[PDB]
Design an enzyme around this catalytic site. Sequence first.
Site, PDB file in Angstrom:
ATOM      1  N   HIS A 197       0.623  -1.438  -0.184  1.00 22.28           N
ATOM      2  CA  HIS A 197      -0.135   0.152   0.062  1.00 22.28           C
ATOM      3  C   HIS A 197       0.705   1.124   0.069  1.00 22.28           C
ATOM      4  CE1 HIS A 197      -4.346  -1.656   0.484  1.00 22.28           C
ATOM      5  NE2 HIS A 197      -3.188  -2.972   0.619  1.00 22.28           N
ATOM      6  N   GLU A 207       0.675   4.079   1.588  1.00 21.01           N
ATOM      7  CA  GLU A 207       1.284   3.555   3.139  1.00 21.01           C
ATOM      8  C   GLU A 207       2.440   3.045   3.722  1.00 21.01           C
ATOM      9  OE1 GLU A 207      -1.706   3.519   1.672  1.00 21.01           O
ATOM     10  OE2 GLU A 207      -3.559   4.272   2.986  1.00 21.01           O
ATOM     11  N   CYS A 261      -7.074   2.062   4.089  1.00 13.55           N
ATOM     12  CA  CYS A 261      -7.596   0.700   4.087  1.00 13.55           C
ATOM     13  C   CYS A 261      -7.360   0.419   5.995  1.00 13.55           C
ATOM     14  CB  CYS A 261      -7.394   0.010   2.682  1.00 13.55           C
ATOM     15  SG  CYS A 261      -5.551  -0.600   3.531  1.00 13.55           S
ATOM     16  N   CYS A 272      -3.974  -0.604   6.278  1.00 11.01           N
ATOM     17  CA  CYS A 272      -3.378   0.187   6.643  1.00 11.01           C
ATOM     18  C   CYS A 272      -3.093   0.810   7.755  1.00 11.01           C
ATOM     19  CB  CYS A 272      -2.882   1.202   5.723  1.00 11.01           C
ATOM     20  SG  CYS A 272      -2.451   0.720   4.237  1.00 11.01           S
TER      21      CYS A 272
HETATM   22  O1  DHZ Z   1      -2.561   1.783  -1.295  1.00  8.42           O
HETATM   23  C1  DHZ Z   1      -3.378   2.105  -1.164  1.00  8.42           C
HETATM   24  N1  DHZ Z   1      -3.505   2.661  -0.171  1.00  8.42           N
HETATM   25  C2  DHZ Z   1      -5.284   3.017   0.296  1.00  8.42           C
HETATM   26  C3  DHZ Z   1      -5.738   1.741  -0.098  1.00  8.42           C
HETATM   27  C4  DHZ Z   1      -5.564   0.858  -1.304  1.00  8.42           C
HETATM   28  N2  DHZ Z   1      -4.273   0.980  -1.501  1.00  8.42           N
HETATM   29  C5  DHZ Z   1      -4.156   0.119  -2.709  1.00  8.42           C
HETATM   30  O2  DHZ Z   1      -5.072   0.508  -3.593  1.00  8.42           O
HETATM   31  C6  DHZ Z   1      -5.001  -0.774  -4.581  1.00  8.42           C
HETATM   32  C7  DHZ Z   1      -6.657  -0.938  -4.336  1.00  8.42           C
HETATM   33  O3  DHZ Z   1      -6.608  -1.339  -3.525  1.00  8.42           O
HETATM   34  C8  DHZ Z   1      -4.204  -1.828  -4.909  1.00  8.42           C
HETATM   35  O4  DHZ Z   1      -2.808  -1.548  -4.701  1.00  8.42           O
HETATM   36  C9  DHZ Z   1      -3.255  -0.958  -3.076  1.00  8.42           C
HETATM   37  O5  DHZ Z   1      -2.865  -1.743  -1.849  1.00  8.42           O
HETATM   38 ZN    ZN Z   2      -3.869   0.478   2.628  1.00 10.73          ZN
END
Ligand code: DHZ
Ligand code: ZN
EC number: 3.5.4.5
Lengths: 294, 294
Positions: free
Chosen positions: B102, B104, B129, B132
């Site tokens: 992610h 984050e 999410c 995270c």
């Molecule tokens: O990196 C983030 N941050 C906020 C929400 C989701 N994701 C990412 O966004 C995509 C959709 O889930 C995936 O690559 C996942 O790791």
């Molecule tokens: Zn996340």
Amino acid sequence: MHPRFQTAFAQLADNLQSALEPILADKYFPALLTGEQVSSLKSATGLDEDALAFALLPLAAACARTPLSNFNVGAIARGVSGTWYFGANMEFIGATMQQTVHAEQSAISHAWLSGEKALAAITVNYTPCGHCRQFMNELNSGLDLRIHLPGREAHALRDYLPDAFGPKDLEIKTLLMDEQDHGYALTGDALSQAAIAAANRSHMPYSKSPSGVALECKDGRIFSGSYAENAAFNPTLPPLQGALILLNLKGYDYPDIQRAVLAEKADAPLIQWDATSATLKALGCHSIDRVLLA
Amino acid sequence: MHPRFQTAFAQLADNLQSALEPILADKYFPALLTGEQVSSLKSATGLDEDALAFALLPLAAACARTPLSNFNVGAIARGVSGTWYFGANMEFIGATMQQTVHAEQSAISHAWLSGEKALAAITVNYTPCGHCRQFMNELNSGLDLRIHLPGREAHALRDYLPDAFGPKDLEIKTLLMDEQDHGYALTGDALSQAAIAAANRSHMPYSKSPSGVALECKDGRIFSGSYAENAAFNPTLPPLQGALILLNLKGYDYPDIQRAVLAEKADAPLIQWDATSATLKALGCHSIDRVLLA
Ligand SMILES: O=C1NCC=CN1[C@@H]1O[C@H](CO)[C@@H](O)[C@H]1O
Ligand SMILES: [Zn+2]
Ligand SMILES: O=C1NCC=CN1[C@@H]1O[C@H](CO)[C@@H](O)[C@H]1O
Ligand SMILES: [Zn+2]
């Protein structure tokens, strides 16, 4: 009675023990309660659903497998059907943290895999981690799902997951527990067909990689698991885990595992093969086959 | 300028573009900004930190790798040191959802791996999410970490993670980003030693399985990753991912990968070996070795 419950059971109220005695009698008590059973319990004790659910937590927790944490977590998913499904965390030595299963995921898959169309609530003996709150938001019950924790007022998921991220964020319209059938033809022996049918129910709107795993026990019993994606990706439930959830909940153990099969597309963007085999070998199962969807 | 930034850049305000032009000039711009640089930017534009951070998001997002989602997420971790680290999500075709990174996690590891002692805040172009939020609660900054999102008042993590689960729940006293040195002796070639040193900084209070991964590029450059456990288990960052984060952020690509090494104990309850190799092969790297800690 399944030895796992032994101590928990000893800890229940007398009127509860009594009502339960007969149910838990069977070693293969399926870690689940039908409406009728629930009703019976309520009559025998004066408990309401919520309190009953909390009261049972310890039996759900008794199904935990925590070689690492030693931290037993129990959960109870309540079907809209009236059936209640147990769930407990599982940790696998020789694998990775990413293979872990949370009490919450257990109960919800238990339910889903069992044919439950939707959940009304979930009760856990410990506040849910963020990974589980996210997992829950994939369900067709959305942010409305109610969550019950000990010593707390109940709340909707939306409360535990403020300003939530979810399927809508990705413009996804089908939720987990919604009805799905990918339509692959079933073929091969029983095991394969179980694996394929599991793939057919899989939730994978993100990657579009259907998959399923089926396990055969010594007694010929079979447990199978469907793949369940998650909008945040990571909290996705791999197909193997589904099977292992069933297997453990239903009263079996790793060594009871005879052979396993995994079905999936060959040309799929994501691939379960490696993780499935690896983990299964870690559990000591050496017979694994893969079947290719089409 | 690294082609990835091309479009983003074109979208910035003139005074911002100007201030940036020179920084982004280098193709190997390291996806990070020192205090001084930040200060400079503030002077040239009239932006405050918060607004500046938001204003840069698009460059952070430009580093994303989203073959699957096509959903680019950028994040900026702000060091207590004054340095700001970019972060972006990564999806790996041919692997599994559990291998995803992610925005984050990227930014925070970027920071951590870089030597940052603690974070003050994080800015993301999309609400985080649950996975995270949980990841964040492993940090030494706890529930206090501030989180900035577009079109929102800022808030502490505790706000996004009510009734949180965390290390304390497991009676853990050392947090991620705290100081650690497991003391393994460094040996072998450079690559091995990088891998081992990475293992030495690893956060693994739960399983006690230290691990580290180091990658060597064609030009001989080396990126290494430390293992970071998480109380909720699953959101743990595998050592491989750390390296890949650095590699991508720093301007490289998968094909630039020459050889990789993984260091870990042989007798550890958890094992990274399989997932590392598998994923690396998926990325097309075939030279992988493992070194055993002691
Ligand atoms: O990196 C983030 N941050 C906020 C929400 C989701 N994701 C990412 O966004 C995509 C959709 O889930 C995936 O690559 C996942 O790791
Ligand atoms: Zn996340
Ligand atoms: O199942 C749950 N629910 C609430 C919080 C944590 N966990 C689990 O509890 C242990 C500690 O993280 C792991 O097995 C993990 O999956
Ligand atoms: Zn959880």
